From a paper:
A primary objective of this study is to ascertain the binding characteristics of AA-II and compare these parameters with those of AA-I by crystallizing the HSAMYR/AA-II complex and determining its detailed molecular structure. A high-resolution structure of the HSAMYR/AA-II complex in Figure 6A reveals two locations for the AA-II ligand, namely Drug Sites I (subdomain IIA) and III (subdomain IB). AA-II effectively displaces the corresponding FA7 and FA10 myristate molecules in Drug Sites I and III while leaving FA1 intact. Although both orientations have been analyzed and refined, the configuration in which an AA-II carboxylate moiety faces R218 yields the best fit to experimental electron density, resulting in a high average occupancy of 0.99. AA-II interacts with I290/A291 and L238 from above and below the aromatic plane, respectively. K199 forms a salt bridge with the carboxylate group of AA-II, which in turn forms a hydrogen bond with R218 and a water molecule. While the space between Y138 and Y161 in the HSAMYR/AA-I complex is occupied by an AA ligand that replaces the myristate molecule at FA1, AA-II populates the subdomain IB pocket in what appears to be a secondary binding site by displacing a myristate molecule (FA10). At the newly designated FA10 site, both the carboxylate and nitro groups of AA-II protrude from this pocket towards the solvent, whereby the carboxylate moiety forms hydrogen bonds with the R186 side chain and a water molecule. The nitro group is hydrogen bonded to H146 and a water molecule. Despite the binding of AA-II, the hydrogen bonding pattern between R117, FA1, and Y161 remains undisturbed, thereby resembling ligand-free HSAMYR as myristate and AA-II bind concurrently at FA1 and FA10, respectively. However, it appears that the refined average AA-II binding occupancy of 0.8 at subdomain IB is lower than that of subdomain IIA, perhaps owing to orientation of the ligand and its relative proximity to solvent.
Human [name] (HSA) is the most abundant blood protein and is well known to transport various endogenous and exogenous molecules given its multisite binding properties and ability to accommodate a myriad of substances. [name] assumes numerous functions in the human body that include ensuring the solubility and transport of long-chain fatty acids in circulation, delivering hormones and other natural substances to tissues, and rendering potential toxins such as environmental compounds less harmful by binding irreversibly and/or transporting these small molecules to disposal sites. Aristolochic acids I and II (AA-I/II) are carcinogenic principles of Aristolochia plants, which have been employed in traditional medicinal practices and discovered as food contaminants. Applying novel pooled plasma HSA crystallization methods, we report high-resolution structures of myristic acid-enriched HSA (HSAMYR) and its AA complexes (HSAMYR/AA-I and HSAMYR/AA-II) at 1.9 Å resolution.
Numbering used by the authors: 3 to 584
The structure:
């Protein structure tokens, strides 16, 4: 178009345009105050309106990258605040934009965002809704500078809905706080999955990513032909390749192009896309990314015909090995939306290993005739793991389920920092409560998506301050093998029990007046420390100390001299436990 800024303004609408301009500036200029950014947005928006009124007005024909770069280089504090980044202004495009991307700071060292009191938030929301929400959008964007801006805008709108509902409700905090907890977790997860996809693309390569995409789209679009799934896989891998490079505009265009193609070819792809494809440009690709699986065709044949029984297996394989393997994955994935993607990838890797070995024998058919028997234990392992864990979760409930995992995992990797052991076990308990509520058919995909997040949260923390060779091995192995590796960890036999420390197991009256969450973490922290000191304690011995501890807290909270009860009966609890263990 003659004026790309006018085209964006008309396509997005003013409100959306202004919010995305704020995010973009915040993600590049992560240290400038909110008020500086608001002025930039207003200036850009007033310029944009000139172009909408006259596409041939001055500078309206300039590229969005040129205009955006020119505006960054007008920031007066650019060299004093960002130093080296101000030298990108001496360059011409496209080198100037590439230079700017290189100086995005993923660890900007900003203070943690403190959640205000419910009444305080609801009052700010009423008195200045836009400043309240937009400031938070700026705070989140500068802290997550690679977070795809449209999706950040989508979260902002869900927050707005939470505040308009709950701030006019009788019990505001009971309404609002769980909504903010759930939204924060979702945003954390979404951010983590974006980073995970890019990290995996670079380490393991384009081929491995295309395999993941073949499985993902085949489950989603089971009625589409292989050739159509494979075309979509190529474009999706290009979308993620570009998007991981970090250029928002290039990422947005590539995504809009794929959404446009998908929506123009619904009849060849899926019957679930009609609603997404009626949505505005801004939301189309995100809607499609989250579309529900289409219903699979009825009476699909067994895979044994084309992949086991046919005389042409090795011939078809050797002609074009990745196309044949992609076809195997497509046929398996479309039939099993109830599998994790990595499970489907394990089956493809198993089939490939068998074909490489067998097609070289004189009688390949005999060699690979039982290959579908090798899939059975691979399928059953996560299936059984899900059944066992969900049944234990129903028996124990979320808190006690977290403590079951806390003990188990402290014993396997006692060297991990106690805060990390608590957070990971807590989050894994949340995966149980979320996914176990699903029917069996959807449990394993649910578990995979949330475990990907939790386990990479563990890996990156460990990466920063490593402690255990076994955790680094599971974190650096095949992502397809990441979950089985963590599951195969055994109790650390060579761990030297940590030395007793008195104040670690000293408790005060503050525990009674703490929030339920902080009291849970306080107790979970001490349970980890208990196992790190007595790693060989049996489950009976541990339950007894936990039962003793529970009596000690409820007796000393109702005590009228609370402080001395906690000290006196605490010395008793510790001395009794030190003899009931070891
Ligand atoms: O934990 C935070 O600091 C945090 C606090 C928050 C959030 C988010 C947060 C994060 N995070 O993990 O940084 C990611 C997010 C990703 C998308 C959307 C929102 C958030 O929106 C309101 O208060
Ligand atoms: O990668 C995925 O999980 C994903 C899965 C998908 C997709 C898309 C996906 C993504 N993504 O990045 O999420 C972006 C997209 C952008 C434009 C069009 C489609 C998609 O359409 C169906 O299955
Ligand atoms: C993309 C996010 C846009 C706005 C999100 C914040 C809206 C106000 C709620 C912030 C309160 C703190 C949230 C928290 O710490 O859990
Ligand atoms: C200088 C960049 C900010 C102004 C232009 C931002 C345009 C973002 C496009 C958002 C629409 C994406 C559509 C999609 O994801 O499919
Ligand atoms: C569209 C190309 C599909 C190619 C299929 C490759 C064969 C499937 C095996 C997948 C192995 C992935 C390696 C890994 O990440 O562990
Ligand atoms: C409490 C943990 C969540 C519920 C049980 C999950 C079962 C283990 C993982 C299942 C499969 C994950 C993806 C995979 O490895 O194939
Ligand atoms: C925090 C360091 C220890 C991390 C322990 C690995 C977590 C195991 C994930 C594998 C599936 C979890 C469900 C299960 O307990 O079987
Ligand atoms: C040497 C150990 C001294 C005794 C201290 C016991 C600390 C164990 C904390 C038990 C936490 C589990 C209780 C709960 O979650 O309700």
């Amino acid at each position: 178009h003659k004026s790309e800024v006018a085209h964006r303004f008309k396509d997005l609408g003013e409100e959306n345009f202004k919010a995305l301009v704020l995010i973009a500036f915040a993600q590049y200029l992560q240290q400038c105050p909110f008020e500086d950014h608001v002025k930039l947005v207003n200036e850009v928006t007033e310029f944009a309106k000139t172009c909408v009124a006259d596409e041939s007005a001055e500078n309206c024909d300039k590229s969005l990258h040129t205009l955006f770069g020119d505006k960054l280089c007008t920031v007066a504090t650019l060299r004093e605040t960002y130093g080296e980044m101000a030298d990108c202004c001496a360059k011409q495009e496209p080198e100037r934009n590439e230079c700017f991307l290189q100086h995005k700071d993923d660890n900007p060292n900003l203070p943690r965002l403190v959640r205000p009191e419910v009444d305080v938030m609801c009052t700010a929301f009423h008195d200045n809704e836009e400043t309240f929400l937009k400031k938070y959008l700026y705070e989140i964007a500068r802290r997550h500078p690679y977070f795809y801006a449209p999706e950040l805008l989508f979260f902002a709108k869900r927050y707005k809905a939470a505040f308009t509902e709950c701030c006019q409700a009788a019990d505001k905090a009971a309404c609002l706080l769980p909504k903010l907890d759930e939204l924060r977790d979702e945003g954390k997860a979404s951010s983590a999955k974006q980073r995970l996809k890019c990290a995996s693309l670079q380490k393991f390569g384009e081929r491995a990513f295309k395999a993941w995409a073949v499985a993902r789209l085949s489950q989603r679009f089971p009625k589409a032909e292989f050739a159509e799934v494979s075309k979509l896989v190529t474009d999706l891998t290009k979308v993620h390749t570009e998007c991981c490079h970090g250029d928002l505009l290039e990422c947005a265009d590539d995504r809009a192009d794929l959404a446009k193609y998908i929506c123009e070819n619904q009849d060849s792809i899926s019957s679930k896309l009609k609603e997404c494809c009626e949505k505005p440009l801004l939301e189309k690709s995100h809607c499609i990314a989250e579309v529900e699986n289409d219903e699979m065709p009825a009476d699909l044949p067994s895979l044994a015909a084309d992949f086991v029984e046919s005389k042409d297996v090795c011939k078809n394989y050797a002609e074009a090995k990745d196309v044949f393997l992609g076809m195997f994955l497509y046929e398996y994935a479309r039939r099993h939306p109830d599998y994790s993607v990595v499970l489907l990838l394990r089956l493809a890797k198993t089939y490939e290993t068998t074909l490489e070995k067998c097609c070289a024998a004189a009688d390949p058919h005999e060699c690979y005739a039982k290959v579908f028997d090798e899939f059975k234990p691979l399928v059953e392992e996560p299936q059984n793991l899900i059944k066992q864990n969900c049944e234990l979760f129903e028996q124990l409930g979320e808190y006690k389920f977290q403590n079951a995992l806390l003990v188990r995992y402290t014993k396997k990797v006692p060297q991990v920092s106690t805060p990390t052991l608590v957070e990971v076990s807590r989050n894994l308990g949340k995966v149980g409560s979320k996914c176990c509520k699903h029917p069996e058919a959807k449990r394993m995909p649910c578990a995979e998506d949330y475990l990907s997040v939790v386990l990479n949260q563990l890996c990156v923390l460990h990466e920063k301050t490593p402690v255990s060779d076994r955790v680094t091995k599971c974190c650096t192995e095949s992502l397809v093998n990441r979950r089985p590796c963590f599951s195969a960890l055994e109790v650390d036999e060579t761990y030297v029990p940590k030395e007793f420390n008195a104040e670690t197991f000293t408790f005060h009256a503050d525990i009674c007046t703490l929030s339920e969450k902080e009291r849970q973490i306080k107790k979970q922290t001490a349970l980890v420390e208990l196992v790190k000191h007595k790693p060989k304690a049996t489950k009976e011995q541990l339950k007894a100390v936990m039962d003793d501890f529970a009596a000690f807290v409820e007796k000393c909270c109702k005590a009228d001299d609370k402080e001395t009860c906690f000290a006196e009966e605490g010395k008793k609890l510790v001395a009794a436990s030190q003899a009931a263990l070891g």
